[PDB]
Symmetry: C2
Subunit: 344 residues, 2 copies
C-alpha cells in the first residue's frame, strides 16, 4: 500500500472461563429481570489472574501472530479502566518485560471504556511521528472483582468481564488496513459518572463499591434529560459519520459492525433501533457470551470476527467504542487477507 | 522542527512543615534529618483532577493559546483519581479548556509527566495542522491508602497539580531534546509476587514500597539492581544531552525529582558532581514529590523566579518505577511576562 498506511499485524485475547447467567442467577449476583433486559448468556470471569497478567498473555498471542520482532516494537501502551492491582507500580512495564522483552517506552493510556481506541490513537500518532518507526503494541486488561466492583450491578445494563486483549499496529504491513480512526469528545458529560456538582468540583474520593446509576440521575436532574440524551446522540453520530467519511464509505459498505459488549437494552437504544441494523451484522452474539472487557471490546470483537472467518478479504469492518467522559471512537478496518491463525 | 513550551503552571495547596509532621508523629528525627525536607504541599478537600484543572487554567492563560488550538489533552497521575469509571481528563478539559479534542490519561508512575510529553510531542508532529497540546498532572496522597512520609521512606509525597502547554507554533522556550529509557526488568521492585513471575493478588493495605524493594533485591541481587538503575539514568542523561548537542557543563539549571536529600545526593550530587545550588533542591524540599509533575513544577519555578536566562539550557530529570527515565534539554528563548526578574 501507500506510505502513511497503517496496518493491523496481529491481535489476540486472553479470556478466562465463562460464568453463565444461570450460575449468576443461582448465586444471587443477577436477578432474572436484569437477565431478561440484558439478554446476556455469560461473562468471562478470572480466578487468580491479575490485569497485567491477562494483558501480557494476550500480547504474547498478538505478537507471535504478528511475526513482528521485539526490536521493531517502538512503543507499548496498556489501557484499563479499573485498579491494576498495585499502587505506584508500572503494569505497562510488566507487559513489556513478559511479552516483548525490549526497551522502548512503555506506558498506560486510559479513557474509561474507550481506552483501547485511545491507545490506538496515540500509537498511530507515535508511529507516524518518525519515519523509522515500525510497530506498536496496545494491550488492555481489567479484573472486576468484589468488594470494589460488582460486575452485574455497579453499572446496570452492562455486565463487566475480566480479561485481556492486544493489538499490534504497524507502518510496514499486516493482514488488515486501518482506513480511518476518529475520536470525538464531549466533556460536558464528565460529571455523569461522578459525585459532586456536575458543573463544579468532584466530591471526595470513593474507592468503595462503584455506583454509577446514582450519579447519572443527579447529572440529568441538573443538566436535563433532553440535553443529556441529545448530546450523547450527537457525539456518537459525529464519530460514526467521521470515521465512515474518512474511509470513503457508508454504513451500507460495512460488512460487520463491532459494537461494545453492553446489554441488549442499551445496544438496541444506541445502535439497532437507531441505525436500523440487524444484530447478525454485529458482534452481538460474541459480546453477550463475553461481557464488557474494560476498554478492550473492539479489539476482542475484531479478533473474534477475524478468527472465526466472519470477515472476508476486501470486506470492511466498523469498530464502535464509547467511554464515560464522554469519548467516542470509530474506525473502519479493511481485511486484506485471512491470517494463518484464522478458520474459514 | 523542534517544539516549544508555550505555558506552564502549578496549583499547590498550603505547606505542612516538617516541624508539624514531627509533632503529629508522621515523621521521626532520622527521617527529617536524612531527607532534609522543609515542608510538603497538602490538600484539604481539593481532588487531583481539580488541582490539575486549576494548574491548567494558569498554564493556558499564560500561553495565550486559544482552546481551538489545543489539539490534545493528556492527564498524568500515579495514584487514585477519586472516582472509578469516570474520566478525569474530561474534567480537566471541561474546566480548563472548554474544547472538543481528545482527552485521555497517560501514566508511567513518577515519570508520567515526561511520558505524556513524549506522546503529546508525537501527536503534534503526526499531522501538519496541529498546534498545541495540554499536559497536566494531579494527585492526592491522603490516608489511609497512602502515607506521604513512610509509604516510600526517603521521598515525601505532595498533593498538587501541574500543567504544561506544548506547541509547534511558538513559545518562550524550545524543547531541544527529550529522551526516554525503559528497564522493565525492574518492574517487580514495586509490587508483590515473584519479581519474575506474575503479580501477587490485589493489594488493599496501604502502599508499602519498602517491603517490595527488599523482596526484589533479595531475589535479583543488590549489585544487579543498583547497576541497572544507574545505567538507565546514565543512558537518559547522555541521550538527552547528545540530542541537544550539549554537555552537562553547558547546563545552567538542573530540574531534579523532589526526593529527600539522601537520595538526591546518592543519585545526582555525588554522582554527577553538580552543585545543589544549580538545581531545584530548595524548591522541591518545600514542595514534596508531585507524582509525575515534578519536572513541570521545577521548570515552572525556575522560569517564574527569573533564575533562568535567555539563551540558557535547562535539564529536566525524571524517573519512575518501572523503571522509566526521561531527560529533556529546554532552551529559554525569552523571559515570559508572568516571570519575576
Amino acid at each position: 500500500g501507500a506510505p502513511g498506511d497503517l496496518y493491523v499485524a496481529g491481535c489476540g485475547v486472553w479470556l478466562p472461563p465463562p460464568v453463565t447467567t444461570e450460575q449468576a442467577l443461582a448465586a444471587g449476583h443477577c436477578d432474572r429481570r436484569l437477565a431478561s433486559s440484558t439478554r446476556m448468556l455469560s461473562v468471562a470471569v478470572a480466578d487468580k489472574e491479575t490485569p497485567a497478567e491477562m494483558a501480557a498473555l494476550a500480547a504474547q498471542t498478538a505478537l507471535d501472530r504478528s511475526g513482528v520482532a521485539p526490536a521493531h516494537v517502538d512503543l507499548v501502551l496498556h489501557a484499563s479502566l479499573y485498579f491494576q492491582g498495585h499502587h505506584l507500580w508500572a503494569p505497562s512495564s510488566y507487559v513489556q518485560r513478559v511479552a516483548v522483552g525490549n526497551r522502548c517506552p512503555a506506558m498506560e493510556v486510559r479513557q474509561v471504556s474507550n481506552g483501547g481506541m485511545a491507545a490506538l490513537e496515540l500509537a498511530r500518532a507515535y508511529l507516524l511521528a518518525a519515519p523509522d518507526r515500525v510497530a506498536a503494541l496496545i494491550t488492555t486488561g481489567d479484573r472486576m472483582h468484589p468488594p470494589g466492583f460488582d460486575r452485574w450491578s455497579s453499572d446496570p445494563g452492562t455486565v463487566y468481564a475480566d480479561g485481556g486483549t492486544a493489538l499490534v499496529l504497524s507502518r510496514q504491513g499486516g493482514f488488515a488496513r486501518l482506513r480511518s480512526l476518529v475520536t470525538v469528545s464531549e466533556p460536558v458529560l464528565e460529571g455523569m459518572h461522578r459525585g459532586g456538582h456536575p458543573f463544579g468540583p468532584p466530591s471526595p474520593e470513593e474507592q468503595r463499591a462503584v455506583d454509577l446509576d446514582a450519579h447519572k440521575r443527579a447529572y440529568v436532574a441538573e443538566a436535563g434529560s433532553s440535553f443529556s440524551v441529545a448530546r450523547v446522540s450527537a457525539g456518537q453520530e459525529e464519530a460514526l459519520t467521521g470515521a465512515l467519511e474518512a474511509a470513503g464509505a457508508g454504513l451500507d459498505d460495512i460488512s460487520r459492525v463491532v459494537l461494545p459488549h453492553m446489554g441488549w437494552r442499551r445496544l438496541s437504544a444506541a445502535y439497532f433501533n437507531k441505525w436500523h441494523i440487524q444484530p447478525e451484522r454485529t458482534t452481538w452474539e460474541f459480546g453477550r457470551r463475553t461481557g464488557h472487557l474494560g476498554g478492550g471490546d473492539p479489539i476482542a470483537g475484531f479478533d473474534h470476527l477475524v478468527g472465526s472467518g466472519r470477515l472476508a478479504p476486501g470486506e470492511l469492518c466498523l469498530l464502535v467504542s464509547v467511554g464515560a467522559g464522554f469519548s467516542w471512537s470509530c474506525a473502519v478496518v479493511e481485511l486484506l487477507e485471512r491470517p494463518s491463525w484464522a478458520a474459514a
